[PDB]
Ligand binder design. Structure first.
Ligand SMILES: [K+]
Ligand SMILES: [K+]
Ligand SMILES: [K+]
Ligand SMILES: [K+]
Ligand SMILES: [K+]
Ligand SMILES: [K+]
Ligand SMILES: [K+]
Ligand SMILES: [K+]
Ligand SMILES: [K+]
Ligand SMILES: [K+]
Ligand SMILES: [K+]
Ligand SMILES: [Mg+2]
Ligand SMILES: [Mg+2]
Ligand SMILES: [Mg+2]
Ligand SMILES: [Mg+2]
Ligand SMILES: [Mg+2]
Ligand SMILES: [Mg+2]
Ligand SMILES: [Mg+2]
Ligand SMILES: [Mg+2]
Ligand SMILES: [Mg+2]
Ligand SMILES: [Mg+2]
Ligand SMILES: [Mg+2]
Ligand SMILES: [Mg+2]
Ligand SMILES: [Mg+2]
Ligand SMILES: [Mg+2]
Ligand SMILES: [Mg+2]
Ligand SMILES: [Mg+2]
Ligand SMILES: [Mg+2]
Ligand SMILES: [Mg+2]
Ligand SMILES: [Mg+2]
Ligand SMILES: [Mg+2]
Ligand SMILES: [Mg+2]
Ligand SMILES: [Mg+2]
Ligand SMILES: [Mg+2]
Ligand SMILES: [Mg+2]
Ligand SMILES: [Mg+2]
Ligand SMILES: [Mg+2]
Ligand SMILES: [Mg+2]
Ligand SMILES: [Mg+2]
Ligand SMILES: [Mg+2]
Ligand SMILES: [Mg+2]
Ligand SMILES: [Mg+2]
Ligand SMILES: [Mg+2]
Ligand SMILES: [Mg+2]
Ligand SMILES: [Mg+2]
Ligand SMILES: [Mg+2]
Ligand SMILES: [Mg+2]
Ligand SMILES: [Mg+2]
Ligand SMILES: [Mg+2]
Ligand SMILES: [Mg+2]
Ligand SMILES: [Mg+2]
Ligand SMILES: [Mg+2]
Ligand SMILES: [Mg+2]
Ligand SMILES: [Mg+2]
Ligand SMILES: [Mg+2]
Ligand SMILES: [Mg+2]
Ligand SMILES: [Mg+2]
Ligand SMILES: [Mg+2]
Ligand SMILES: [Mg+2]
Ligand SMILES: [Mg+2]
Ligand SMILES: [Mg+2]
Ligand SMILES: [Mg+2]
Ligand SMILES: [Mg+2]
Ligand SMILES: [Mg+2]
Lengths: 160, 128, 33, 224
RNA sequence: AUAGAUGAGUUUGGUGAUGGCUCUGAUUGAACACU
RNA sequence: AAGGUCAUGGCUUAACAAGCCAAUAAUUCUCUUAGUCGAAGCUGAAAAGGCUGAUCGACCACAUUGGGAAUGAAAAAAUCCCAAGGCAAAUAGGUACAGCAGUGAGGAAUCUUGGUCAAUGGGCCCACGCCUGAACUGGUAACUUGGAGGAAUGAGACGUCGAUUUAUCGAGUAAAAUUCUGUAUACAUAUUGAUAAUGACAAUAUGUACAUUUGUCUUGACUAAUUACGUGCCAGCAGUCGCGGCAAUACGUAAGAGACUAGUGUUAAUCAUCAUAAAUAGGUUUAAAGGGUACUCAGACGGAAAAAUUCGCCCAAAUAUAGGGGACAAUUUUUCUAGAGUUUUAUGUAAGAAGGUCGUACUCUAGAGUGGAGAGAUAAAAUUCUGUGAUACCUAGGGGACGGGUAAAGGCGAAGGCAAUCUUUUAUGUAAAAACUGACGUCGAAGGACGAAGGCAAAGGGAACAAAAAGGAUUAGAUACCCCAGUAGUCUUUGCAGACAAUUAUGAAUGCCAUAGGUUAGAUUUUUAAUUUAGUCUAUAAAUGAAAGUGUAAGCAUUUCACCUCAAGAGUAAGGCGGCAACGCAGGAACUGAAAUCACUAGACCGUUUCUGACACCAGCAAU
RNA sequence: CGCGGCUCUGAUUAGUGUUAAGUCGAAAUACGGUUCGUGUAGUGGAAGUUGCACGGGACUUAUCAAUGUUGAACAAUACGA
């Protein structure tokens, strides 16, 4: 549920605050959807499903993950590579917007307004560097990827 | 508070602040007429010193209040109809009102030159 | 709350506790216990 | 946060920006520091990032929530098990002084343990037996015990000749008019004499304290 | 409707906070005083 | 089952069944207040903004108050019937201005007892026409808004006026004077509101003519703008902070200066200021604010991989017919094992309870014990004990509670709390391996349960301790602190009671973030010592914080419950509930303030520590 | 007519607010000169004070009788502050 996305956001903040080169997440399709969007937006370096121990650092892309079955699904985890440029984490802040207590949904015209830096609904306008990820019927997208495809949906979190 | 606590009515109006002139603020009136029950003197509190000319007025609404008499020298006394407005004497406790100088029986300061509109003083007309 | 301010509540609670003991008899006559 | 803000990694970025424009608007900027162009193309290296350290030993597979992932691991070699076995069977082999000071770090270039225990550059020590044992136990397929006995016996025959040569070398020297200085057996005893005396003085001076304080314990000062 | 988001005086020996009060803006089916 | 109905529905009826809605207030009742609504009015940058509920439109209700029916297509009446009090009426049976204008009263406060049915609308009428306080128009009020309310030139009248560096600085391009305009407005003409005809009253256009006021506030800072004199904590000013005590830019006067202007100030109110009740969007260690506790009904929230259904969600609206998209959401289905649990006697352990004991000391009794005048108390004493033999030293019996060492930053329980010992009895929790169930979870208003000490009630117990009461001292006085004694009470059993600095001044729970040194109970190992699980504490990093500090959280996030909204009054009053009572729960307003409040910094102080100087002291000599 | 609610008034009586210039003590802040506070039960002109348990928002304010070492001679072309 949305609680896992909320844990994924606070965990990545703590892993970047600690300047960790790697970090693990519970293996769920929802966490994978947000991680693929962060990687697609350029905030993380890699995504790899593995066990409770991180794969070999050097051979990370050519890593061969074993098939996921009911005999090991309980130990699978998503390993994320974190970026740090100019003595600063590239994924500094991950502020959630929709929470377990309330799921915030935005319309296409509200996202068009938030994309240019104007408040709309419970959201606020985006500034230089900030990003916004929306969970739509076309997958987890960035607010500028959503307005291009002309869809709304559930707002997940704002990435500074 | 949580969304559930707010939905049940946790947000309530803040406790009201007492007005400067409750006898006028309670009924939205700018001024009220009254009869002078007593005309005497009040003593300021610790810092200031002197004798403040005050009057015990019985408003047309029934309330008995203490009003400050602005200016130097007055004409009202017992059984005198005067107009009361808001504003208080800061150093006098219980004096939460002022008397209008151009009122019914209270006269304006005769030898007043500056701020005549505050003391109900007609222009000397010495030029004409 | 500091000890200085708690002593203000300490006196207000003792004065009240002392008032009820004193007027307990007349409150018992008027059926107000 | 008691620590201070160190911006040592951004001296170039900060210095290059301050030199871009002139403080007196309307004039060309002055010449920058002389070091600005020197490190123009030598940026600092990334610091404070915690990577997955080298795993010198296989990590515990049964662990489901492992801790200390960013902690360096202990370096262990197959020889550690062998060194502990030898030096526990030969404790007095640790009394032979060994120089762990390096000369040029090129010791392992002339070590061919297929020949024997005597190599170039290193002395005949318990390490030679461990390296010779490991070679036999890996190449000739011997077992831990078999390879141990072989390299161990070769090591004894060499030590015996070293001790037999000291005695004979001194015995023949005197047969042709050769005399030597004091030996450890004599020097060692003289040092004990000088130290034994210091104890005698302490005991003699410390016993007088007890006998005096003991006799004075009773309050016999009346002198009846 | 994409220009629209602002402060000030006042607690303390002093400093930083907390927290009210007042002023700064707009207005009235208003009243009163001087005009 | 039958009837009725376009059709549906106990809508109606008969016969059977005992259901249906609700459980967190459905339902009912009391008190207080109010016409409701709209970008209708005001207001904010904004929020499903806030406030109001005038003029405008919509809706509701009412026509002195109360109680009613008929007529009619339809009550949609200022109609009708009835009663009561007011006014009028008496042998009558009218009237109620919340229709227009108007009067009296109340009030800080809101206007003409006009003209016309010419225009628009409505009633009656074959038609013509009649009626219309609807309406249109004239009047009153700066209440508000909009507009006008004068432009250009103006140099030596070699004049005046006020300051003053008596010759400088200002009034001052200001005035006078000169040259133009013809604004509101007045008058005249024409057109028009109206056409089949009808003009109450006025608008617009054109021509001619006219140059008409100043007023008010402020002037220490916030806040634009200064001096002189007078006054002397007086008189007074004051929105906030403040000013005034004899050389006041703060009061009063004079002049100047800064502003708005037919208005200007003040009072009252509303929004905003005020993330100052925070849904958007707050907070509770030390400042307002975490419930004494966690098992729990309602409620909120809560895994993995697929599927059905809703079509929630999105395109996406206009309260959108009909469709599309499939991540997510709701109900449901099937699988999975990471959460949560069960089994495998764990170890360790002052959780709890029952029935029995042990011991050190104390205490009483007895032995006309031994001994033979003191003892105990306190800083010192006194009251007090002792020749009826004390204290001291013993022997033999009885009684009641209490729990030495071990002992630790130790442990246990939801908390309160739990420490001698044997047996009996009780739920959790922790470690390692396997096996098992398969989301069965977290939080939790209320109800119920538990809840320290003191206390109430009853029946026991009674050594010791000890509120009360009393005595002796100390003291200026001494309820007191100290002392001789001493009753409740503490203990046992059964109930009541429910308040605590019930504390980590920190609710419970979940995910997560870098180290170091100890310590508690296990586990693994090459059991040396390392590794590891779950606790606890110390000191730090990143960070966080008002800081103190925290850093297994007061960090990053999330869930849920409780609670807070300036001080003071006040956790008080009244009504209510619980209790035998004591008290508990719940919980205001009036009056009065501009401050209360927290952490830190540097000092000073301490009947505070440790030092350093001085005839400061000690000692000695001399002196008053 | 009765019961209930509500409003006003009431001999007598309680509480609290404000008010520099009165009086009686010295309770708190330092070890405040009896540690201070919480609860509960008494007590005293008043602040106070007593019992019982509890909290630190008081004692972490903590700073050696382990008294501190001939830890391998001397001399050489070695060694040389
Ligand atoms: K508090
Ligand atoms: K009328
Ligand atoms: K007409
Ligand atoms: K001040
Ligand atoms: K659909
Ligand atoms: K759908
Ligand atoms: K406790
Ligand atoms: K006693
Ligand atoms: K006494
Ligand atoms: K530990
Ligand atoms: K914080
Ligand atoms: Mg004041
Ligand atoms: Mg003036
Ligand atoms: Mg201070
Ligand atoms: Mg009404
Ligand atoms: Mg009437
Ligand atoms: Mg009147
Ligand atoms: Mg007509
Ligand atoms: Mg006709
Ligand atoms: Mg004209
Ligand atoms: Mg006509
Ligand atoms: Mg100024
Ligand atoms: Mg003035
Ligand atoms: Mg003045
Ligand atoms: Mg005007
Ligand atoms: Mg608590
Ligand atoms: Mg409670
Ligand atoms: Mg409490
Ligand atoms: Mg299954
Ligand atoms: Mg299985
Ligand atoms: Mg489990
Ligand atoms: Mg056991
Ligand atoms: Mg005898
Ligand atoms: Mg005897
Ligand atoms: Mg006993
Ligand atoms: Mg013990
Ligand atoms: Mg436990
Ligand atoms: Mg629970
Ligand atoms: Mg409860
Ligand atoms: Mg009890
Ligand atoms: Mg009891
Ligand atoms: Mg009893
Ligand atoms: Mg007990
Ligand atoms: Mg009970
Ligand atoms: Mg307790
Ligand atoms: Mg709770
Ligand atoms: Mg512990
Ligand atoms: Mg710490
Ligand atoms: Mg209060
Ligand atoms: Mg009260
Ligand atoms: Mg009560
Ligand atoms: Mg309460
Ligand atoms: Mg200090
Ligand atoms: Mg002297
Ligand atoms: Mg002397
Ligand atoms: Mg003399
Ligand atoms: Mg009375
Ligand atoms: Mg005391
Ligand atoms: Mg004292
Ligand atoms: Mg004391
Ligand atoms: Mg006490
Ligand atoms: Mg007594
Ligand atoms: Mg203290
Ligand atoms: Mg301290």
């Amino acid at each position: 549920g949305i609680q896992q996305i909320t844990n994924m956001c606070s965990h990545l903040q703590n892993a970047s605050r600690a300047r960790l080169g790697l970090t693990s997440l519970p293996n769920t399709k929802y966490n994978l959807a947000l991680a693929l969007a962060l990687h697609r937006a350029g905030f993380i370096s890699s995504i790899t499903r593995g066990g409770p121990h991180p794969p070999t650092p050097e051979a990370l892309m050519t890593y061969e993950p074993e098939p996921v079955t009911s005999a090991n699904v309980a130990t699978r985890r998503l390993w994320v590579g974190l970026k740090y440029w100019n003595e600063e984490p590239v994924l500094k802040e991950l502020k959630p917007i929709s929470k377990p207590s309330r799921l915030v949904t935005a319309s296409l015209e509200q996202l068009n307004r938030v994309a240019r830096g104007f408040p709309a609904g419970y959201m606020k306008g985006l500034q230089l560097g900030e990003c916004l990820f929306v969970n739509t019927d076309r997958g987890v997208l960035e607010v500028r990827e959503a307005v291009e495809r002309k869809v709304g949906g559930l707002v997940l979190c704002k990435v500074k | 508070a949580t969304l559930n606590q707010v939905m049940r009515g946790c947000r309530k109006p803040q406790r009201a602040r007492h007005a400067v002139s409750p006898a006028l603020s309670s009924i939205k009136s700018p001024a009220l007429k009254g009869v002078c029950v007593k005309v005497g003197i009040t003593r300021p509190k610790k810092p200031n010193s002197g004798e403040r000319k005050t009057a015990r007025v019985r408003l047309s609404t029934g309330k008995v209040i203490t009003a400050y008499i602005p200016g130097e020298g007055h004409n009202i006394s017992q059984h005198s109809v005067v107009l009361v407005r808001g504003g208080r004497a800061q150093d006098c406790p219980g004096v939460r009102y002022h008397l209008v100088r151009g009122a019914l029986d209270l006269a304006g300061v005769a030898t007043r030159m500056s701020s005549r509109s505050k003391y109900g003083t007609k222009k000397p007309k010495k030029a004409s | 709350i500091s000890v200085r301010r708690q002593k203000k509540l300490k006196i207000k609670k003792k004065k009240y506790k002392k008032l009820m003991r004193r007027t307990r008899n007349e409150r018992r006559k008027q059926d107000r216990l | 946060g008691k620590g201070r803000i160190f911006q040592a990694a951004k001296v170039y970025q900060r210095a290059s920006e301050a030199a871009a424009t002139n403080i007196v608007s309307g004039l060309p900027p002055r010449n920058p520091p002389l070091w600005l162009k020197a490190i123009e193309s030598i940026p600092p290296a990334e610091i404070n990032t915690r990577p997955y350290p080298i795993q010198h030993s296989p990590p515990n597979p049964r662990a489901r929530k492992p801790r200390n992932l960013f902690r360096p691991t202990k370096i262990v070699y197959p020889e550690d098990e062998l060194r502990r076995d030898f030096y526990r069977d030969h404790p007095w082999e640790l009394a032979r002084p060994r120089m762990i000071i390096e000369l040029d770090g090129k010791d392992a270039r002339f070590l061919d343990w297929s020949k024997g225990l005597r190599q170039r550059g290193i002395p005949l020590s318990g390490e030679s037996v461990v390296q010779r044992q490991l070679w036999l136990m890996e190449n000739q397929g011997m077992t831990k015990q078999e390879a141990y006995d072989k390299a161990r016996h070769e090591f004894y025959k060499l030590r015996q000749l070293e001790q037999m040569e000291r005695r004979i070398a001194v015995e023949e020297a005197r047969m042709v008019g050769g005399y030597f200085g004091k030996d450890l057996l004599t020097v060692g005893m003289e040092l004990e004499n000088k130290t034994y005396e210091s104890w005698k003085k302490w005991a003699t001076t410390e016993i007088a304290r007890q006998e005096s304080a003991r006799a004075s314990m009773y309050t016999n000062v009346v002198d009846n």
